[PDB]
Design a protein around this nucleic acid. Structure first.
Ligand SMILES: [Mg+2]
Ligand SMILES: [Mg+2]
Ligand SMILES: [Mg+2]
Ligand SMILES: [Mg+2]
Ligand SMILES: [Mg+2]
Ligand SMILES: [Mg+2]
Ligand SMILES: [Mg+2]
Ligand SMILES: [Mg+2]
Ligand SMILES: [Mg+2]
Ligand SMILES: [Mg+2]
Ligand SMILES: [Zn+2]
Lengths: 100, 62, 50, 106, 131, 107
RNA sequence: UUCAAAUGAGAACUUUGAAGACUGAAGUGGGGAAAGGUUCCACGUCAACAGCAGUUGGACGUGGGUUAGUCGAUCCUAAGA
RNA sequence: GUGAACAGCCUCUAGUUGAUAGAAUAAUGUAGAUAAGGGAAGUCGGCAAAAUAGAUCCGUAACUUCGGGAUAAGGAUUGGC
């Protein structure tokens, strides 16, 4: 197990070329948390309760924008030169209709 | 997607080199929306963009 | 040069405003024989020589 | 000169989530704190006590919160908790053990 | 194989062997003969200033003195401390002429060794006095 | 047929005599060829952690042996020409010596 | 130089991440003078050009951008005109 | 950091990772190396390479415009603790 831990740490680390990212800035997942704590042999009752509370708190409630605009797009003619509403278009401002 | 502008703006906003800025590869659409330094600052605050630590040059042997 | 003369900058302004392709509606006129800008200039192709 | 310094650590979050032992942490500190270059030399200089939520170190001879953090990170690494639990300062010379940010599974 | 080893230990650039130098130091007559040599034009220092341990001529007495005060000479002195490693050692390690090798070791420890040590002591103190 | 096995690859005899700037890239190509040989899949995908293990000692410092976990799985996309592909992962062990091919149980 | 993902009709060459290297402060870094004149930056976007390629570009199309009592010119005289 | 040192070599900040690619490893090339014994017998000619090289100490001829020649030549040495 000690030799395996050495090998895994060596494959993990690249300190000569760059520093390791800070854990306090990263965020991880409860699935990995649960499997690691289970490997350590702790009881996951409290952590599972916290995760259940978080999952119940993060609810998805739809709104009118979700009903109306959810599968639609556009609602404005796409310009030929990627221009804003009041941006001049030197090339096309003299030709009003799209056929011409 | 092309995030070159966001990478440059993140380096300028955080105050480090472009070599020291981490853009979350999972949040590509959110990062691609951010066209201003204000939106870049918001991404830095919530952690989509991270400042990397310096590469170590130890002096223990010296 | 960064520190330039007003005469130089005025000529540069004229060149910038001249830098364009044809307006499309010119092609639609009766008996139009103008089909492209034959005096278009580019900064890396023909120098203005002041 | 040898004014008594008090350092406190709050272990309540990992203790209540069931992945930490304050008594073992205190025993590790007792056995591993070095005074004048050797372990087991804490005679009337460093006292480590705990009551299940707060671990208190009282020292009069060359102790700092950086050293305390170093020892705590060693203990967490030995228990394979270094990837999940960190040692934070809340106010001066009072510290706590806090989980890193975990996304809910969904 | 490499150029350094080739050009240092080429056969035409060979040096005297350690068992031969051990025999040179073992007897007093050899020591006196090598200490007092005729004026030879083709040796450095006219054949004088000869270190027996290193089998080396020096140009001058001051050169010989600075040589004796050196780690190179002390390395050679350490090398000449033990049994001189004849073919008898290799034969005995193979398990052949064992009694002959053991008799030779006994003779070194009893007679030839201490006489060589006494000659070396006398030679060193003579070099200290004359230098 | 979905399956997962662990193999040892001898990179030493595959990289015997290769130019130093080309050793690790040739190791990548050799492992792809190895997975193709063992699973019949022309679509081979290497884990970036495996690529790290290959490149760990630079361009010319590839290990003599590597322990691989190779999984033949199903291609879910409709646009692909191949219904099967292989995913190669590294197995980080104490030593890659003396290990034989094994079938990993799938759960 | 390599790996995965994304984008895409199409990716050795685009983007992000994962790695391996290099310039090694007399720099492959950070600014200016002469010269250039918009090449700067954003959006759109690949016919031609980038001696392979191209979804990329100092390319093509449409725009945005240079704010001074104190920085310069301007004033002074130099060899000279 | 090494070192006398803006040398060479390695690294931090910052910046690049650009220059058509893939596979094979015949001859002849281009660039770089090693070679038993001999040691210029090669050649118009030692061309080219090799050999020397830092520092400390010992020592240093002719000739001379007395200033030089001179690092003349020739020797001893060098790590680590
Ligand atoms: Mg070969
Ligand atoms: Mg380098
Ligand atoms: Mg270099
Ligand atoms: Mg640009
Ligand atoms: Mg082309
Ligand atoms: Mg343009
Ligand atoms: Mg030869
Ligand atoms: Mg001849
Ligand atoms: Mg001849
Ligand atoms: Mg001379
Ligand atoms: Zn000697």
């Amino acid at each position: 197990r000690q030799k395996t831990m050495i090998a895994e740490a060596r494959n993990r680390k690249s300190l000569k070329n760059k520093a390791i990212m800070p854990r306090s800035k990263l965020t991880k997942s409860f699935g990995k948390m649960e499997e690691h704590m289970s490997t350590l042999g702790h009881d996951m009752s409290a952590l599972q309760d916290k995760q259940n509370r978080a999952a119940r708190k993060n609810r998805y409630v739809e709104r009118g924008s979700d009903v109306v605009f959810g599968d639609q797009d556009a609602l404005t003619a796409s310009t030929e030169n990627g221009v804003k509403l009041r941006q001049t278009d030197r090339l096309l401002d003299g030709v009003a209709d799209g056929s011409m | 997607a092309n995030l070159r502008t966001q990478k440059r703006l993140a380096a300028s906003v955080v105050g480090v080199g472009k070599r020291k800025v981490w853009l979350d590869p999972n949040e590509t659409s959110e990062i691609a929306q951010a066209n201003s330094r204000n939106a870049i600052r918001k991404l830095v605050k919530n952690g989509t963009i991270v400042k990397k630590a310096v590469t170590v040059h130890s002096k223990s042997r010296t | 040069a960064a520190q330039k003369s007003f005469r130089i900058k005025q000529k540069m302004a004229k060149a910038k405003k001249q830098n364009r392709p044809l307006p499309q509606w010119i092609r639609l006129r009766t008996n139009n024989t103008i089909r492209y800008n034959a005096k278009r200039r580019n900064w890396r192709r023909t120098k203005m020589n002041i | 000169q040898k004014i008594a310094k008090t350092f406190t650590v709050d272990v309540s979050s990992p203790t209540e989530n069931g992945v930490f032992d304050p008594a073992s942490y205190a025993k590790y500190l007792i056995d591993h704190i070095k005074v004048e270059g050797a372990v087991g030399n804490l005679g009337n200089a460093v006292t480590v006590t705990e009551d299940g939520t707060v671990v208190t170190v009282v020292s009069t001879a060359k102790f700092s919160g950086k050293y305390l953090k170093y020892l705590t990170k060693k203990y967490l690494k030995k228990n394979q908790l270094r990837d999940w639990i960190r040692f934070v300062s809340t106010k001066t010379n009072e510290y706590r053990l806090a989980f890193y940010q975990v996304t809910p599974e969904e | 194989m490499g150029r350094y080893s080739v050009k240092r230990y080429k056969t035409k650039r060979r040096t005297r062997d350690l068992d031969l130098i051990y025999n040179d130091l073992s007897t007093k007559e050899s020591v006196q003969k090598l200490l007092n040599q005729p004026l030879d034009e083709t040796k450095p220092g006219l054949g004088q200033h000869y270190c027996i341990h290193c089998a080396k001529y020096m140009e001058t007495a001051i050169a010989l003195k600075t040589h004796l005060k050196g780690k190179v000479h002390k390395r050679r002195v350490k090398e000449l401390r033990g049994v001189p490693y004849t073919q008898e050692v290799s034969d005995a390690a193979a398990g052949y002429n064992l009694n002959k090798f053991l008799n030779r070791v006994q003779e070194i420890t009893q007679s030839v060794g201490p006489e060589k040590e006494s000659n070396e002591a006398l030679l060193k103190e003579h070099l200290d006095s004359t230098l | 047929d979905v399956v997962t096995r662990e193999y040892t690859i001898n990179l030493h005899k595959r990289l015997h005599g290769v130019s130093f700037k080309k050793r690790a890239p040739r190791a990548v190509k050799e492992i792809k060829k190895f997975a193709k040989l063992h699973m019949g899949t022309d679509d081979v995908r290497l884990a970036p952690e495996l690529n790290q293990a290959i490149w760990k000692r630079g361009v010319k410092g590839v290990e003599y042996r590597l322990r691989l976990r190779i999984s033949r799985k199903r291609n879910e996309e409709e646009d692909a020409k191949n219904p099967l592909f292989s995913y190669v992962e590294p197995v980080l062990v104490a030593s890659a010596k003396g290990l034989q091919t094994v079938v990993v149980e799938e759960d």
